[PDB]
Amino acid sequence: YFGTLLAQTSRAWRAELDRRLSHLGLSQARWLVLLHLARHRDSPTQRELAQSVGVEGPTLARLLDGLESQGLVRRLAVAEDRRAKHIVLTPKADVLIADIEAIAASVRNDVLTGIDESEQALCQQVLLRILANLENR
Amino acid sequence: YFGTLLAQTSRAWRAELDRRLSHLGLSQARWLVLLHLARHRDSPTQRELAQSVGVEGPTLARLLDGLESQGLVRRLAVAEDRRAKHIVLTPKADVLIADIEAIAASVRNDVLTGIDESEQALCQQVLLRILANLENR
Ligand SMILES: [Hg+2]
Ligand SMILES: [Zn+2]
Ligand SMILES: [Zn+2]
Ligand SMILES: [Zn+2]
Ligand SMILES: [Zn+2]
């Protein structure tokens, strides 16, 4: 049950990151929204962020209210022809994102212990094909 | 962001299974509880099932109320020295589980298209080490 092994490994890794991030009080998915904002250079729309964070739109709206309440995000227009609200991080958020990335790097280091760089690369190519098979549905 | 590629691939595969199962009206995780019951030979406790399905206990209790309401599961004692409630499938559930497994096999077939048996095996060994690294925390 290949799909089950993938889901279990993914759940275990996100549990471990949620544990290492637990001091930050960023409950529900909220730290994972921040992490994804930190990682893309474009400012996403709500629709784009929900896609990548992996959550329904109405769920993201609640997550975003939380982060916005804490002064970590704003919903803003970003171009003369991008008038919809885009989600942008604030300067306040930067000491926070720096810490979240450092902790996410720590979990990545530790969970990859003992795994060969070539085998990691091969594992990634298998996952990318599974994803293309799904996305090309 | 290896962890992100794993989570995205896992989310895409579970989305696809949820799509193929959508006619069965087994909303929230409920079909995934059934699938896990179908796949283990022992009857799990609530604690065991929550672990493997990947959900908090109180969340599983609601999922289970749903399935129990539909006559798909019972919570029962299973031994003279296993007096706690164990979750058992009903005979009613069998035409249902048969269909869910057939559909889960279809998704597995299709998402593995183009991926070599050796590379699948290698991918699984990488995931198993990541999981052991996490479980040996
Ligand atoms: Hg892999
Ligand atoms: Zn913490
Ligand atoms: Zn992202
Ligand atoms: Zn359906
Ligand atoms: Zn199971």
Which three-class secondary structure string do you get for chain B? CHHHHHHHHHHHHHHHHHHHCHHHCCCCCHHHHHHHHHHCCCCCEHHHHHHHHCCCHHHHHHHHHHHHHCCCEEEECCECCECCCEEEECCCHHHHHHHHHHHHHHHHHHHCCCCCHHHHHHHHHHHHHHHHHHHCC
C-alpha to C-alpha distance for B114 and B117, rounded to whole angstroms: 9
* Backbone torsions φ then ψ of A42, nearest 5 degrees: -70, 155
Round to the nearest angstrom and report the end-to-end CA distance of chain B.
Answer: 21
**Shortest CA distance from A39: residue in chain B:** B1
Count of structural domains, chain B:
1
Chain A neighbors of B52, CB-CB under 8 A? 8
The label of the residue with tokens 């199962």 reads B21
Cα separations in angstroms, A69 against A65, A66, A73 = 6, 5, 8
Say whether A23 counts as a known binding-site residue: yes
Task: Please name the residue that has the structure tokens 């999922």.
Answer: B63
The closest of B132, B137, B123, B135 to B2, measured between CA atoms, is B123
Angle of helix A2-20 relative to helix A30-39, nearest 10 degrees, comes to 90
Domain containing A47 — which CATH number?
A: 1.10.10.10
Identify the experimental approach.
X-ray
Q: What one-character DSSP code corresponds to residue A112? A: T
Which residues of B fall in the annotated binding site for Zn(2+)?
23, 36, 40
| CB pair distance less than 8 Å for A3 and B17 | yes
Distance (Å) from the alpha carbon of A51 to chain B's nearest alpha carbon: 9
- Give the residue numbers spanning the domain of A64: 1-137
d(CA B66, CA B131): 31
CA A85 to chain centre: 19
Q: Are A91 and A98 in contact (CB under 8 A)?
A: no
Report angle CA A1, B61, A9 to the nearest 5 degrees: 30
- Around ion ligand 3, residues with a beta carbon closer than 5 Å are A 36, 39, 52
How far, in Å, CA of B92 to CA of B113, rounded? Answer: 34
Residue labelled with tokens 């896992």: B10
> What's this structure's resolution in Å?
1.8
